[PDB]
Amino acid sequence: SLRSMVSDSVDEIVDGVSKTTAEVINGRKSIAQYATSLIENNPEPDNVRTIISQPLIKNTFLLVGFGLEKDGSNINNDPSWNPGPTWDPRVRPWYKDAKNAGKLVITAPYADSASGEILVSVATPVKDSATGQFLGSIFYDVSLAELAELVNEVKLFDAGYVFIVSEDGTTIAHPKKEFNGKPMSEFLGESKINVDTHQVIINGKPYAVSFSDVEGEDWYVGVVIDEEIAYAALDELRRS
């Protein structure tokens, strides 16, 4: 039926998007781990700068920086980036999340020190190759705007969008940047994830909403699809 067709298509769209999203995030983590491994091999300042200032790194991340435990100094790849004169990398979420985990992690969303923009960072600790002593942490900042734009390149009957959330409904990435880091209830009017496709009313209008898990993080992708438009589009695909 039309309803079963709409429901099955919505299931398929969000399942597909969760696969693409996992690949995007894994690609970012793989680049970050590669750069980190090269830094661990030789963490001399000149080498660090070479590694993090190449086009691949500049294009993949908003900003990359290596903060040192010994003195709270840092080397980063943006001479203009200014978090203020008292900034200490050692007290930042990316630094402590990497130190505490002892391995690559992605932070929860947080506010950038310089811009106030909500982002997440891939974060990695750096160990002495001989002794295993913790030397500091590296962050690789991920634009949530670019992430939302990327995940929304899928065909969604020309009226609908894809978003990403944590297990607890915190918005990781939404086409409207204002929602990043905010509870998904601000745009959905539901606060708990219901994975299975279901109806959500926004401003008197019905939408189909569905979620799918993202492999490698506790995240989920969600879709919000105009029900009127989807039904009409598929009815045209059926009757005529």
**Cα(10)–Cα(210) distance, rounded to whole angstroms?**
7
**Contact between 55 and a copy of itself (CB under 8 A)?**
yes
**Residue 103 site contact among a copy of itself, Mg ion, none (CB < 5 to 8 Å, cut-off depends on kind):** none
Q: Which of 44, 59, 86, 196 binds a copy of itself (CB under 8 A)?
A: 59
Residue 239 contacts which entry, Mg ion, a copy of itself, none (Cβ below 5-8 A, type-dependent): a copy of itself
Show Cβ contacts of residue 24 under 8 Å, excluding neighbours closer than 6 positions.
147, 150, 151
Task: Choose among Mg ion, a copy of itself, none what residue 238 binds, the Cβ cut-off being 5 to 8 Å by kind.
Answer: a copy of itself
Residues linked to residue 163 through DSSP beta bridges, in sequence order = 222
Give CA–CA dist 73/89, Å, rounded.
7
User: Which of 25, 39, 51, 230 is close enough to bind a copy of itself by CB under 8 A?
Assistant: 51
Does position 73 interact with a copy of itself (CB under 8 A)? The reply is no
Restricted to residues 96-135, the positions that interact with a copy of itself (CB under 8 A) are: none
Of residues 5 through 24, those in contact with a copy of itself by CB under 8 A are 5, 8
- Contact predicate 138/33, CB 8 Å: no
Bridge-partner residues for 226, per DSSP?
207
Q: Is 212 annotated as a binding residue?
A: yes
Longest dimension (CA), the chain: 71
